[PDB]
From a paper:
Parvoviruses are linear single-stranded DNA (ssDNA) viruses with T = 1 icosahedral symmetry capsids, affecting both vertebrate and invertebrate hosts. The VP monomer for both aveparvoviruses retained the basic capsid architecture with the conserved eight-stranded jelly roll motif (βB–βI), which is extended by the additional βA-strand and one alpha helix (αA). Like other parvovirus capsids, the surface loops are dominated by the large GH loop, located primarily at the threefold region; the DE loop, which forms the fivefold channel pore; and the BC and EF loops, found at the two-/fivefold wall.
RCPV was first identified and characterized as part of a 2018 viral metagenomics study from the fecal virome of wild and domestic red-crowned crane populations in China. Following cryo-EM data collection, three-dimensional reconstructions of both aveparvoviruses, utilizing 405,850 RCPV and 35,131 TuPV extracted individual particles, were determined at resolutions of 2.66 Å and 2.35 Å, respectively. The short threefold protrusions of the RCPV and TuPV capsids are primarily formed by VR-IV and VR-VIII. For example, VR-IV was significantly shorter for RCPV than all other genera in Parvovirinae. These differences contribute to the truncated appearance of the threefold protrusions and fivefold pores of RCPV. With the technological advancements in recent years, cryo-EM is capable of generating high-resolution maps of macromolecules that allow us to discern fine structural details, such as water molecules or bound metal ions. Both RCPV and TuPV maps had conserved additionally ordered densities in the threefold region of the capsid, which represented potential metal-bivalent cation-binding sites (most likely Mg2+ or Ca2+) with ordered water molecules. The bivalent cation at the side of the threefold protrusion is coordinated by identical amino acids in RCPV and TuPV, including D262, T263, D272, and A273 (RCPV numbering) of VR-IV and Q355 of VR-VII.
Numbering used by the authors:
A (entry chain G), B (entry chain A), C (entry chain E), D (entry chain F): 27 to 531
The structure:
C-alpha cells in the first residue's frame, strides 16, 4: 500500500484474442531523463533554405519542454510478429478501441559522480510528475513514426522522448535570430502549470482513453474482381463502349463503367542533389513548402518508386537499450529504406495518371486528377510499422482524410502523457541533484477487428514466414541480442503489409 | 387590443449574451412602398454580351412582384461593432439558431399631392399584407449582400426591397424581346395567391424560424502550429523526405506529410476593359458564364489581389434614411473596395497553386487542383459584412458546400417574408390612392457560439479598436450623422475579420 | 383601455406632507421634438483655448443623440414657494426617497406646412419611444442646473432637452477636426439599441426609482453656539491657551480647542478679460483645466464675493412656454446673478484662510488647507434652485463627497429617461413626416425630512415672505403671466436659502 | 499514508475561471536552506547617513531568524501572462478571496563534502518545522516586492527567504555598535517558541487564510468621460463660470464643478549624487527620513518621470534556479527600470499640481494639496508585478489607505508561514549535519472579480500581445531557458497595466 517495498504493478505483454476483439499489452521499462536542466528552451531554425539534402532548411520555431512524453503509436509496438501475422490472416479490418496506460514501479535514481565512475542510488523520496493531456491543452505531436517511439520488442528499454513543439513561425529575415520567427500568433505552452500527479516509488499512475466509434479502420481486404470487369462475361451489354460504339464481348476496358477508380496526382522523383523543394510535387504553406508525395494510392507494378509507394526507414536491427535519441538523426547505415508496394491495388486502383481530353480529340496525361463523383479506390496498403492512428491537424474543413503514411483516422487520439523528473535542487544556483527515473509502463490497447472468411472454393492466400526472414532473425533476436524485425531494404517484406484477405465483391 | 391608439410592439435592439448563446435584436423602422402600381412585371435582359464592364451583359428573365420582402441576412445588421468585437474575441465559432421576426406599429400613410407639396396623413383602415414563405413556394433570393439589406445601425430607416426573381432563361436570339427568353421551364410566381395576413394599424405580425442542428458554423479560430511542422522538432523520423531520402532534422517541409492542405484553383485577375467573361476563371452555365473567383481559400501574403481574396464593396458612410434602392447601382465613390486578407491562413492553407509532376521528372504548376483524400484546409476568413447564412440553390448533389463570399451553410434558411401595401383603388382605372406603409420590424436571432479559451502561457492576440478607426468614426456616427462602419479601402480592417482566436492543434 | 378617447393619466401637482415625509408631484406638459432628423451627430469643440470670456475654449467631443430626456433635478421644480418655505421652517434636513415618473396623455402631432402657416393635426398611430436607463448603460449628465430643467411652475411647458454627451477627448492638434479628438477610449453610445417602449396615444409609461438609504441629506440646521466657545463661561480651564499660557476667562479664542473647523482653500476672483483659466484656482485635468471654485465653505460676511460663495444665475422671470433651449445660451439680461451668502456659517465655519507657522516663529496664510483629523464644518447653505441630488462621476476613490454647487449625495440617482419621437418617414430619402409629440409627465418624489423642534426659551427665527418679494411677484405670476421666483440680483433672498433652523449643540 | 514511498501531494499550477471568481494555483519547488547555523542574529545598521546613492545610510536594527518564510505576494506569481491578460480584458476589478497553501513532498537532503564534490543524500528522518503566524505574533514584512518573492513562472525554483525583521531603533550615537540602537521599545522575537508542525518526508502541511469582505479591490476600469465635462454639451447652465461670470457653451473647464479631482502633492526628482534624503519630498520619521514619492496619482503625459509615476525594477530575464538571494542586491544590469504611466488617468486625475489663490488676486502652484471634501480621483494603475495585497503597519488612524506602489488594502493579510530545517547536530559543538530541505508548495488563491461589459456602440480597446513582446519572449522562455516577462526599460508595457476596461460614468 504505497510502501517502497511492495511493487505497484505487474508486467504484461501478452495479447488476448476475442472473437472480434484483441487486447494487446505493451509493457516497457522506461527511462525518464532530466531534460535541459528542467528548462523550457526556445528552439527554432531561422534558415528557410527549402532545399533537399540539407538539414535545417525549413524555418521553424518552438520550445523544448523539460517534460518527456509517451509515444506508443505504431503497430509494431503492440503486436508481436506472431500476433501481427494472425491479425493479417484473420482480420479484414481492425481499429483501436481503447488504450489503458499504467505507469508503475517508479524508481528515481540519483546519479553520483565519483572518480571510479557514476554511482547509482535510489532516491526514495524523489518524485516524477505525470499528467495526461486529455483536454488537448498542449500541442499534439501528430507526425507519425518518429524516433520517439517505443521499441517493438518487450525487452527494449524505452527512453521517453523530450516533449518539444513548433509554433507559428514568421518567414525569416536576414541577420536575425529565432525570436524574429515568433509572432503574435506564436504560442508558448508551459506544461508545468497543468495539474500533474507527483509520484514517488510507492505510487502508480494510470489513464484510460477510449476511441470514438467514428475511428477509422485499417483494411486488410483486397478485391478479387477487377473493378473494370464487373460484368457477366457471357453476355453483351446494352451499354456502348468508351468511344460510343458497340461494346464487344470480353473487352471490358472498352466498355463504359458505372464507377471510376480513385484520384491520381502525377508524382515524380528527383535525384538532383540540393534541389529546391518546389522541384517535388507539393505546395507552399506559410513560409515553407509542403509536399504531397506519395499522394493518392495508385497501383504500381514496379518495386522501387519513391513517389508512388509509401517509403520509410526501418531499423536494420533494434538494440535492446539504446541511449536517449533526442537530437540524434537515425544513422543511414542502421536503417533499411523500405517501400510498400501497391501491386495489391491491382483489382481496384488505377495504375497510372489519367488521360483526359486535352484538345482536338486528343487525350493528355492528367498531372492532377482530383476527386470526381463516382470515384472508388482502395487505400495504400497499411504496414506493421505504420502508426496505429493518425491525427490530422485541426482545421475548418478536411476531405476524406487518409494518411498516405499510415494510421487510422481518429476524431481524437489519446492525449500525450507527460512525464518529467521532479527537479531536486542542490540549494545552489543552476545546480540540481543529478537524477533520472526508471519506471515500467503498460500500454493496454483494446482492438476491434472484423473476422474475415473466404467464400471462394479454391485455396486462398495466407501470409507465412519464409526461410530468408527466419534466417535473417526476423521477429527474433539475433546472435548479438538485437531484434531484427525488417530484414531487407527495398520492397518491404509481404509479412508486414496489409490488404491480404480476399473480399468477394 | 387592436385599437389604433395602443402600440402593437416595442423597440429592442439590445444583445443579450448567454454562456454559449447570444440573442440579438434588430429593430428597424421600415418603409413599405407600393411597387409598380401593384403589378407583377416581366423583367429581363435580352442581351447576353458576357463582357466585363458593361451592365445587362448577362441574359436573364423574370418578374418583379408588387411585393416587398425582408432581407436581414448579414452580420453587421445583428451585431453592433461592440458586440461583433466581443464575438470575435470570445468565440471560436458561432452559428444562428433561431430567428424571430415581429412586424408591428404598422402605419399606412396616404400621400396627397397639393400645390405646397406632398401631404401625409394616416390611412387608419389601410392594410398591409404579410406572408412568410416557410414552404419555399416562391423563389429564394440566395445571393448574399445586396442593397436589399437592412442598415447595420438601428436608427437607419429600412425600405423593404421589391421582390423580384429570375427564372429559366433561353439563350437570346436576335431581334427578339425578353419573352423569347421565357421557355417551358420558366416559372411565373404569383405571390398574391398565397394566404397572407392583412394588417391594419392595430395588428401585429410575427413569424419564427428555427435553424436545423446541421447549420454551418462560422469559425473564428486560427491554427497556431504550421500543418507542415507537426513533428517533435528534437527527434528524427523513420519517414523519408518528399524525394524519398533521409528526412533531416528541422526540415519539415522536405518530410512527407500525413495530410495535405486544401485544393487550389489557379486564379487570375484581368484588367482588360470590356474583356470577355471567359477570360476570367470560371465555366459556362446555361447561356451565361459563371465564374469561380475567388475559389478555394489560399494564404496570400499580398494585401491586394482580387482573385485570391474575398473582395466586396462596403459603404464609406451609411446614411440614416436613404431612398428606396430599387434599380439603383451603388455609387462607386460611395463605397470602399475591401479585400479580406488570407494571411490568417498561414498555418494551414496553401500559399500558392500546387506543383505536381508534369513529365520527365519535372513539376508543373497545377491550374486546377481538386480535392484529393487527406486534404485539410481552413475556410476563408469570415467578416462582419458577410451574410449570416448562405443558402445554395437546390441541386441533386453538392460537395462540401462553402460560400467563398461568406455566410454559414444551412440545410434551410428563413423563408422570405413578403410585405406589400394593400392596393387602395380610387374607383378609376389604373389609379390607386397613393400610399406607403411604415412599420417597425424586430429581427430577434438566437445564436450559438463556442467559448474559446487560451491554453498558451504567453500573451495572446485580442482584436482592439485603433485610433485611426475611432478618428474615422468607425462604429460611430460622424458629424453629419452618417454611420461609418468600414473606414478604408483596400485591406479590410482587422476588426471585421474572423479567424482570430488561437486553437492549439 | 388604450383607446384614443380615454385619458391615460391625471394631472397632479400637489404636495402631501407626512409627519416626516413629503410627497411632491410635478406634472408638466412636455413637448418632445424631433432632434436633428433622428440622427446621432458627432459634436465637439476642437479649440482648447482655456481662456475666460470666450465660448468653445474647452476642447470636447461627443455625440448629440436623436433622443430627448427628462431632467427634473432641482428643488424649485418639486416644491412651490409655499412648500419650500414650510420645508425650510419645518425640517432640519431632508432627502429624496423615491421618484415615480408617469408619462401619459401622449399626443403625436403632425406639423404640416401650408401657405397660411403650419397646420397641426394629431397623428393617431404615431409613437414615441421611451426607455429609462436604470442600468446606467448610457452616459449620465451629472452637471447640475442646466437649461435642460423643467419649469418650477406647474403651468410651464417643458421641452425635453436633446440628449448629448461628451466622451474621452484627446488634446487637440492644429489643422484637425473634432474626429482627431476621438481616441480609443472615446465611447459612442447608440440609445436606439436599448429596449424602449414604443408608445401611441392610448399608451402610458411609468418608471420608479428608489434612493438608497445612503443618500445624502440637505441640512437646514444652523449651529447656535460658536464652536470656539463651547466652554462654560463661568469657569477656568486646566487647558493652556494657543500660545501655551494660562487660558484667561472669557477669551475662548485664545484657548486650545478639541476640534477645528473645516478645510479652507484660498480662493480668488479674477476680472481680467480673456484671462487664462489657470489664473483661477483649480487644476489641469486631461487637456483641459478644472477649477475648484468656490471650494470648501467658509463664512464670509461680505455680500458679493464670487469665489467664496455659491454663485449661479436665476431667471428674472420664467415664461410659461419658452421654445426649445437646445444650443441657446441663457441671455444675460434675462438672468439674475445670485450669490448664496455663507454668513449662516458664523457659528461653525472658518471666516478666512488659515494661518500656520511659516518659519522663524511666524504664521503665514495657508493657500491650501486640506482636511486634517478633528476638523468639523458645515456645508454651504443649500438653495431652492439647487439640484435635488448630485451624482459624482464614477471613480476609484472619493473623499467626503459634497457638491459646493448643491444637491445631496447619492450612491446612485434616477437613470435618465429617454424619450424620442419615432421617426415617420415619407418614403423619400432624408425626408420625415414633420412631427413632434406632447405628453404630460408626472414626477412624484417621496421625501424624508427630520422635523425640527426648538428647545430655546426665547423666540426663534422663521423665514417669512417680505413685501419687496411679494411686490416683485416672487412665487407668483406677474402681470405678463411670467413666473418671477427670484426677484433680485446679488445676495440671493433669504427665503431660498437653507441652514435656518437652530440646533442646540 | 505517511510512508516515504507515497507522494504527499500533487502539482497544480492551473487557473480555473468562474463567472465572477478565479482560482489560481501556484505550485513551486522550494528550497529551504539552513540559516546562519540555526541562530537568531542581531542585525542592524548603525550608520544613519540618510543620503541617496549609498547603502546602509538608514539606521536600523533587528534580528535575522533561522527561519525561512513564504512570500507569494505579487500578481505575476499567481497569474500567467495569458491569465493576466484575460483578467485585464475581462474584469473591471478583482480582489483576493482566500489563499490555501499546501506544503508537501518534503525532502530533507544531507549535503556531504567529499573530495570529488558535494554529495547529496536523502535524510529520511529529517524534519522541517512549519508554523503559520495567523495570530500576528511575529512582525509582518509588509514591504511589497522584495527578492523574497516566488518566481512568476511555475518551473522556477523557489528558495524561501530568511526571515528577518527590524525593531524599534534609537538614533545612533558615535562610537557605538548596533546594540546601542536597541532600546526598551525594541522587540526580539523567538519564532522557535511558537508551536510548529515538525515534518518528515511522509508529512504534508497546509494552512488556509480567508480575506475579509472589507478587502480592497484592484480596479481595471477607466473613465470614458472627462470629469470636468459632465454636462450636456447642447445646453447652457444656470451655473456661473469659475471666475463668477456667464458659463459659455463648450467651455466646461471655465464652468464650476460639483466635484474636484484627487489631492496633488508637488513631487520632484533629484539627480544629485549622494544628496540628502530630505532633498526629496518626504518627512522625517524617528531617526530616519520617510519619503512620500510618488504620492497621490496624477495624470502625466510624459513617459519618464520618477516622482510622478510608480517606478520599480523588473527582471530582464528570470533564471529558473537562482541561488538563495539573501543579502544580495539585485544587479542593475539584470533589471529593467519600469515606470507605470498615468496617462490612463486622463479622464479623472489632475495632470499637475493645483493653483490656489496666493495673494492679491493671484494663484500659486500648491506644493501640498491635501484632501478636501468633494475630491474624486482614480488610483494609480495597478500592474502585473504589483503585490496582491498591501498591509499597512498597524496604527491608531489611517486615511483612505492606498499603496502607491501597489496591492489591494486588507484589514488583515495571510500571516507569514515560517519554514525552517530542523537542526541536526553532529554531537560536536557548533557543528550540524549540513542539510537543506526541498519541498513543493502550492499556493491556491480564490479570487473575486467583477465582469466588465461594454455598453458603447463603437469598438472598444482590448489589450493584445504585440510582435515586439513576442519577439522578446515576453511570457515565454528564451533560448537560454530564462523567463523574460517584462522585455523593456522605461514605460512599462501596456500589457501589464490595469485601468483598461471602459466604465460609462
Ligand atoms: Mg455488343
Ligand atoms: Mg533522418
Ligand atoms: Mg486660567
Ligand atoms: Mg451661459
Amino acid at each position: 500500500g504505497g510502501g517502497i517495498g511492495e511493487s505497484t504493478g505487474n508486467w504484461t505483454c501478452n495479447t488476448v484474442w476475442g472473437k472480434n476483439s484483441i487486447i494487446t499489452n505493451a509493457s516497457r521499462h522506461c527511462v525518464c531523463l532530466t531534460r535541459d536542466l528542467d528548462m523550457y528552451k526556445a528552439i527554432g531554425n531561422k534558415d528557410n533554405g527549402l532545399v533537399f539534402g540539407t538539414e535545417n532548411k525549413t524555418a521553424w520555431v518552438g520550445w523544448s519542454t523539460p517534460w518527456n512524453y509517451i509515444d506508443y503509436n505504431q503497430m509494431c509496438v503492440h503486436f508481436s510478429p506472431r500476433d501481427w501475422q494472425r491479425l493479417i490472416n484473420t482480420a479484414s479490418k481492425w481499429r483501436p478501441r481503447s488504450v489503458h496506460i499504467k505507469i508503475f514501479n517508479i524508481q528515481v535514481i540519483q546519479k553520483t559522480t565519483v572518480s571510479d565512475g557514476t554511482q547509482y542510488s535510489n532516491d526514495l523520496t524523489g518524485t516524477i510528475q505525470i499528467f495526461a493531456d486529455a483536454q488537448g491543452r498542449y500541442p499534439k505531436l501528430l507526425y507519425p513514426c518518429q524516433t520517439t517511439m517505443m521499441g517493438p520488442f518487450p525487452n527494449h528499454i524505452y527512453y521517453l522522448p523530450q516533449y518539444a513543439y513548433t509554433t507559428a513561425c514568421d518567414g525569416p529575415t536576414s541577420n536575425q535570430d529565432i525570436n524574429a520567427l515568433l509572432n503574435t500568433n506564436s504560442a508558448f505552452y508551459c506544461l508545468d502549470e497543468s495539474p500533474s500527479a507527483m509520484l514517488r516509488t510507492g505510487n502508480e499512475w494510470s489513464c484510460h482513453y477510449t476511441f470514438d466509434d467514428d475511428t477509422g479502420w485499417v483494411h486488410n481486404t483486397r478485391s478479387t474482381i477487377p473493378i473494370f470487369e464487373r460484368a457477366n462475361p457471357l453476355y453483351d451489354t446494352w451499354q456502348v463502349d468508351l468511344r460510343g460504339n458497340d461494346a464487344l464481348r470480353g473487352h471490358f476496358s472498352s466498355w463504359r463503367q458505372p464507377w471510376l477508380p480513385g484520384p491520381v496526382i502525377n508524382m515524380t522523383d528527383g535525384t538532383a542533389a540540393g534541389a529546391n523543394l518546389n522541384t517535388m510535387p507539393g505546395v507552399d504553406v506559410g513560409a515553407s513548402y509542403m509536399g504531397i508525395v506519395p499522394g493518392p494510392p495508385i497501383c504500381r507494378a514496379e518495386n522501387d518508386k519513391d513517389e508512388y509507394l509509401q517509403t520509410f526507414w526501418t531499423p536494420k536491427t533494434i538494440g535492446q537499450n539504446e541511449g536517449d535519441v533526442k537530437n540524434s538523426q537515425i544513422n543511414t547505415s542502421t536503417a533499411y529504406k523500405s517501400q510498400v508496394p501497391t501491386g495489391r491495388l491491382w483489382e481496384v486502383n488505377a495504375r497510372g495518371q489519367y488521360k483526359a481530353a486535352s484538345s482536338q480529340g486528343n487525350v493528355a496525361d492528367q498531372q492532377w486528377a482530383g476527386c470526381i463523383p463516382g470515384m472508388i479506390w482502395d487505400r495504400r496498403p497499411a504496414t506493421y510499422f505504420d502508426p496505429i492512428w493518425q491525427e490530422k491537424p485541426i482545421t475548418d474543413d478536411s476531405f476524406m482524410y487518409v494518411s498516405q503514411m499510415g494510421g487510422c483516422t481518429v476524431s481524437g487520439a489519446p492525449g500525450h502523457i507527460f512525464v518529467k523528473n521532479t527537479p531536486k535542487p542542490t540549494g545552489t544556483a543552476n545546480e540540481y541533484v543529478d537524477e533520472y527515473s526508471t519506471f515500467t509502463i503498460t500500454v493496454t490497447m483494446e482492438w476491434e477487428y472484423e473476422p474475415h472468411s473466404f467464400s471462394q472454393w479454391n485455396n486462398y492466400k495466407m501470409i507465412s514466414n519464409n526461410e530468408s526472414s527466419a534466417q535473417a532473425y526476423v521477429g527474433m533476436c539475433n546472435a548479438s541480442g538485437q531484434y531484427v524485425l525488417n530484414h531487407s531494404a527495398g520492397q518491404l517484406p509481404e509479412m508486414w503489409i496489409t490488404k491480404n484477405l480476399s473480399r468477394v465483391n
